[PDB]
Design a protein around this ligand. Structure first.
Ligand SMILES: CCC(=O)c1sc(CCOP(=O)(O)O)c(C)c1Cc1cnc(C)nc1N
Ligand SMILES: CCC(=O)c1sc(CCOP(=O)(O)O)c(C)c1Cc1cnc(C)nc1N
Ligand SMILES: [Mg+2]
Ligand SMILES: [Mg+2]
Ligand SMILES: [Mg+2]
Lengths: 568, 546
């Protein structure tokens, strides 16, 4: 049922062993067909478009020259790995990618022996590649090791750490730099600007080759076959064009980075946040805003245009983003770090050591909190309420709608005693009225409904579901607003007035907001059970945000069901 | 006082220092060096690092207009001369003591301490933020930081340099190159080529013990625009020619013993060979010992690669430094289901190093991550048993966390895998059950007999012995949890969650670290102050039950 007529050469390729059976003279035609196949298949599945178009020729060359899967190939991030999957046994399922029950959005160890490392977060390729290259030397067979890392990903500190270590330990590893002059938006940094274009990499201890034409499959084959045989850390710099082969994408690589389903022939919280940045900077000279390479995702495009000298993209450097903000605060400016919950994991030590321990007032605006949807396990905003909660002198807010979100950003922005964090999900609010801004009382929740027997303590954007449940069970419903500090007096009062409590968060149950409530009740030697509703103790799989929420029982029907089963 | 150190007598503030003639700065450096050798030889601490920054510290405060101009010390272990010159001369003898001067520069302690340091490599990053603000302030404030050759190996520092080379802040970075961090710096490291390529104006390397040369050099570079990099060379220790087994030694002994017969074992440290007890290991199995420099991130992800290659990696890392590798643990080990063993030293209270170094959170931030096994040994035998257990546990990563200092002398039994997620009942009592996670067990044992309580060694923070917890809850009026970790999100909070999930609202007293960064002192003092000895544990229970 695969169009052999349209794809006569690709048809003969369903495994890399078949691929290596072709004569090199046919690899160009196969590249044209892979690209054609990708173009309409991703057109209908939605997802990462221009990235894969940019690696077609590279992927063909790599699997033609390397004896995969014995030889180990690691793709960084994996946003560019659709051709990789198509050539490695998943040709006829590429259309299901990013869908519930379909191919993982990125390479996944459990999906194929061809996926050496599960990826999603960036810049892990070189680090893992070194480990597998050292192992391969010890194994003393002739196993080869190669990774592909983007010009954006290579700005991360861990890529520098790995490159420096390779130059010392000298592993037999090939690093392919897929240089397309792009991150998601345009790439930044002193490296991005950097006679020898490989002078830096040679200083780090690598044998540098290039730059070379990343869309020249036969040249890549000849050059890769050579470098595969070379000893020690090797570094091949290729140039690709993002969206190569599709002019709209070649002209707008940002827009076509992640596409909806298209024919190739309400305010979001991100936008609520960026709008609040513009409106604050407009009347306050102290506001400064920081992103680690996520301008478009965090909603900062308009802000960057209107206030260019207040906007800072530090490249893919979550760590520096935070300690840079601490520096601005030390110099009496008011910095805002915009950062996804999942990527905030990488700057945890800077939060603790360079902000909380310092009592510096940095505002953290944590986007993609909770279930993120089709990006799946590697990207989930699943743990910030838990890992932030345990750090002393941190304020942690969970807005329930777009107005609460603005009131909390404003609150944290003007809170000068120490760090504040405001976390919100990907997607749109309720249409709530945007009221005038004033600081909310710290650590105080808001009663929304008075019932009996059961009280629901909601933390975050799942409030509408709790409200529908509250009405059906005649429950009391409170919007806690603060994960830290908790409204202790409120918790104690409703415990004395109900037989059972329920907590609701879009965050891991273990150590989360509801666990903090448990701790308060225990600390006061109470004897009221609490049903902690939140994320289960496994990494959340891919799907529609609404799909996965229903699947985990985080909708009104699932919450009511959970409560009833728990009450015997 | 004055007779011994005449020039030092005159400078109790940097304002006076900058009024001295240049010609007298060398004499000042000798007295400052002598003054150092008297006080730290009787107070302990990081004095050899300070001996090597004597001239640089004098040159910096002489040239820059501190405290208006902003100077940032990386780590802070080389900043005793700094504290001495910034009004704390007479209290330097108290450094690292309970209620003394902080071990490292601390903002709350002096307007001359621009950034609290302890963790390494933060200086450049903060220095860029300070420099950007100083430019917008438009008042000619200068910015300068000092980072060592070890600290500049961290990813953090590269990201800052990459940013500064693009954005071009008015910042001086002084590379204080002494050829080794704690141990010899091991990494790829024109000595200026990297920094020039990253966009800096590079000068040096110069003689870091030539105070007049540094003065003149720093005067020039302080007035240059954009990112400036001064490479200096110093000698570590410039001026001075030179019980029971700790858990670090226990782990190192286990390492050597396992590697002796198992060629698959690989041991990794981010530049903490001595602290983590791996010196003998490193001499005995050099081709399977990996010091990745001060790069906790790469440490973990390299181990993932070794495990993908069917080798058996062990990552030795302090709890406090493990914070900087959190994303690699989650994304590159736990999401991968890869069986990396984490040997987590300085768990709990670390003592004199104070707030920046406490092992205060690993039970909390590890426990919320799916597919992690977290083990808290109560003694040195249990620690060997648990390292063995994790080493041979193939389904996923395992973490074994233990405190700085010595164990109890427990008998070291033959090694066998421990049943996963199961506690050991140590004492059957009445009314109350104490559930211990880790090395406070003996304190808990004293309380349990005093109160005629049940006592359990929980062993696993994750997965918890759910069956045991529920049985305990049906047999007692109250439970008590104990751990050397933040109460918030900690191990006992884990127990709370199991009881709530089963609707077993039996009250639980969570004993652990309170919600503030723990200050400096001896581990014993601080444990007593926090009520984590037997006397404090009993009083907590009694107060809570009244
Ligand atoms: C699905 C793709 C994706 O999440 C991408 S992709 C990309 C540009 C890379 O540029 P490139 O390497 O292609 O040149 C960024 C910045 C991100 C988000 C991100 C941010 N921070 C970390 C540690 N990890 C990330 N993944
Ligand atoms: C108080 C002294 C101290 O803890 C030192 S000191 C030093 C060598 C630096 O070498 P140097 O920079 O002087 O050349 C290390 C490696 C450490 C431990 C450490 C490890 N990891 C981080 C992120 N932070 C740290 N602080
Ligand atoms: Mg790119
Ligand atoms: Mg060469
Ligand atoms: Mg050094």
């Amino acid at each position: 049922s695969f169009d052999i007529a349209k794809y006569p050469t690709l048809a003969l390729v369903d495994s890399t062993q078949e691929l290596r059976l072709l004569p090199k003279e046919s690899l160009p035609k196969l590249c044209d067909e892979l690209r054609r196949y990708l173009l309409d298949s991703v057109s209908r599945s939605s997802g990462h478009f221009a990235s894969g178009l940019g690696t077609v020729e590279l992927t063909v060359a790599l699997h033609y020259v390397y004896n995969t899967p014995f030889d180990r190939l690691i793709w960084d991030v994996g946003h560019q790995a659709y051709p990789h999957k198509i050539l490695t046994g998943r040709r006829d399922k590429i259309g299901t990618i990013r869908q519930k029950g379909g191919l993982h959005p990125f390479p996944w160890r459990g999906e194929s022996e061809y996926d050496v490392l599960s990826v999603g977060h960036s810049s892990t390729s070189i680090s893992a590649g070194i480990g597998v290259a050292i192992a391969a030397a010890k194994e003393d067979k002739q196993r080869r090791a190669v990774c592909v890392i983007g010009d954006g990903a290579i700005t991360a500190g861990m890529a520098f750490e790995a490159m420096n270590h390779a130059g010392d330990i000298k592993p037999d590893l090939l690093v392919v730099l897929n240089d397309n002059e792009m991150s998601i938006s345009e790439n930044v940094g002193a490296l991005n600007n950097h006679g020898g274009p490989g002078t830096l990499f040679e200083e780090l201890g690598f044998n540098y080759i290039g730059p070379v034409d990343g869309h020249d499959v036969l040249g890549l084959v000849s050059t890769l076959k050579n470098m595969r045989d070379l000893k020690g850390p090797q570094f091949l710099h290729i140039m690709t064009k993002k969206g190569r082969g599709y002019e709209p994408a070649e002209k707008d690589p940002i827009t076509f980075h992640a596409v909806p389903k298209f024919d190739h022939t309400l305010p979001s919280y991100s936008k609520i946040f960026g709008d609040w940045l513009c409106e604050t900077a407009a009347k306050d000279n102290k506001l400064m805003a920081i992103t680690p390479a996520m301008r478009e995702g965090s909603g900062m495009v308009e802000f960057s245009k209107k206030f260019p000298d207040r906007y800072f993209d530090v490249a893919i450097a979550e760590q520096h983003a935070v300690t840079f903000a601490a520096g601005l605060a030390i110099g009496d400016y008011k910095p805002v770090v915009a950062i996804y919950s999942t990527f905030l994991q990488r700057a945890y030590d800077q939060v603790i050591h360079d902000v909380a321990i310092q009592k510096l007032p940095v505002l953290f605006a944590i986007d993609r909190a909770g279930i993120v949807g089709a990006d799946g396990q590697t990207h989930q905003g699943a743990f910030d309420l838990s890992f932030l909660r345990c750090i002393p002198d941190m304020v942690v807010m969970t807005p329930s709608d777009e107005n609460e979100c603005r009131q909390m950003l404003y609150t944290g922005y003007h809170y000068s005693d120490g760090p504040c964090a405001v976390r919100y999900p990907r997607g749109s609010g309720t249409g709530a009225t945007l009221e005038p801004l004033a600081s909310l009382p710290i650590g105080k929740g808001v009663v929304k409904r008075q019932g009996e027997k059961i009280a629901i303590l909601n933390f975050g954007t799942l409030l509408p579901e709790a409200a529908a449940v509250a009405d059906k069970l005649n429950a009391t419903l409170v919007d806690m607003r603060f994960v830290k500090p908790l409204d202790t007096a409120l918790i104690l009062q409703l415990a004395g007035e109900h037989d059972a409590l329920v907590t609701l968060e879009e965050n891991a149950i273990m150590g989360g907001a509801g666990s903090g409530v448990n701790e308060v009740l225990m600390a006061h030697r109470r004897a009221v059970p609490v049903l902690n509703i939140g994320l289960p103790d496994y990494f959340i799989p891919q799907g529609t945000q609404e799909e996965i929420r229903a699947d985990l029982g985080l909708d009104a029907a699932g919450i009511e069901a959970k409560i009833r089963d728990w009450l015997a």
